[model samples]
Target: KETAAAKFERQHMDSSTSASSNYCNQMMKSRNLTKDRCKPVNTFVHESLADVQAVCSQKNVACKNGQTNCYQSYSTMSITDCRETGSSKYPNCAYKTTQANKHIIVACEGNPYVPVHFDASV
Candidate 1:
C-alpha cells in the first residue's frame, strides 16, 4: 500500500527540473490532480522528498486548520504555486505561474518523522 507521504510526493513534489511556465498545466493533468475538477490553488515543492519530510523536526507552527502539529521549514525551499486564473473554466482551466523560495509549513503524523499534509508556504 502507498503511504500518504509517498502519495504526496508523487502529486506535489518535482525535483528533476526547474519547471517551465507550463509546468502547472502539464503536471496537474499528468499527475491526475485535475481529474474530477480543476484545483483552485496548489503548490509543488521542488525539493527532495527526504528534505521535505525532515521539516517535521523543524519549528512548530499553527496550521490553517488550527492544528499544532504543523512544522515550518528552517530554510527556504523552491516552490511553485498554481493559481487558477479568472479566465479559467472547468476543463479549460488556466493557471498563473509563480515561483519563489520560501519557508514551507507541513502537517506531520504517525511516527512523527514525515510530513502528511501540505499546510501552507510562508
Candidate 2:
C-alpha cells in the first residue's frame, strides 16, 4: 500500500519544471487526486524534496484545524495552487492557476520528519 507520505511525494512534488496554465487539469487527474471528486484546492511544490522536507525543522505553527504539528518553511519557495473555479462539476471541473513564492505551512506526522498535509502558505 502506498503510504500517505509517499502519496504526497507522488501527487504534490514537482521540482523540475514550472507549472503550466493547465497544470491542475493534467496533474489533478494524473496524480489520481480526482478519482472520486475534484479536489477544490491543491498545491504543488516546485522546490526539491529535500528542501521541502527540511521545513519540518522550521518554525512551529498551528494548522487550520488547530493542530500543533504544523511547521512553516524558513524561506519562500516556488509553488502553484490549483483552485477550483465557479461551480465545480465533476469531469468538467475548472481551476484557476496561481503561482507564488511563499512560506508553506504543512503538518508533519510519524517521526515528525516530513510534511503530510499542506496547511497553508504565508
Candidate 3:
C-alpha cells in the first residue's frame, strides 16, 4: 500500500542487521532508497519495529523542517549512518558507514499518528 508508515520503515528501520564495513553499500541498495540517485546521507535505526513505533508517543518537538508532528525518541537507539563518499558516482554509489547510539527524530501522521518521515538522529 505504500503508506507513510511503510515508507518510514523502508527508509529508517533496520533492526536485524549489524553494521558491516560495506553496510551502506548493501543496505542503501537493498532498501531501494537509492536507485537513479544516491542518498547523500541516511540513518537506519537498529531497534525493533515496535520500539521505533513507540517513539511516536515520545516527546513532541519541532522538526528540522519545522513540522510540529515530529517526535524525538525518549531513549538513545542503536543506529548506523550512511554518508556518500566524495568519489561516489551515479549507478555505483559508495558510502561510508558510521554506527552509534543516538536519539532519533521523525515526523508522524494519520489516525494512528505513526512515523512517516525520518528527520534526524541526535
Report, for all candidates in order, the number of backbone clashes: 0, 0, 0
Error of 1 at 43 (Å): 0.6
TM agreement with the true structure for every prediction: 0.91, 0.92, 0.95
In the range 1-122, model 3's lDDT, one tens digit per residue, is: 78888888898889887438899999999898779699899999999999888898999999998769989999999999999999999789899999998999989889887889889888
Backbone-clash count (model 2): 0
Q: What is the lDDT of residue 105 in candidate 1?
A: 92
lDDT of each: 0.85, 0.85, 0.89
Question: Cα lDDT of model 1 overall?
Answer: 0.85
Superposed model 3: Cα runs more than 4 Å off: none
Between the candidate structures 1 and 3, which one is better when assessed by TM-score?
3
Tens-place lDDT digits, model 2, residues 1-122: 98878877877788987547788888788878778888888999999899989888899988899889899998998999999878768987778878899999988887657878888889
What's model 3's overall lDDT? Answer: 0.89
Candidate 1, clashing residue pairs?
none
Per-residue error at 39 for model 2, in Å?
0.7
Ranking by TM-score: 3, 2, 1
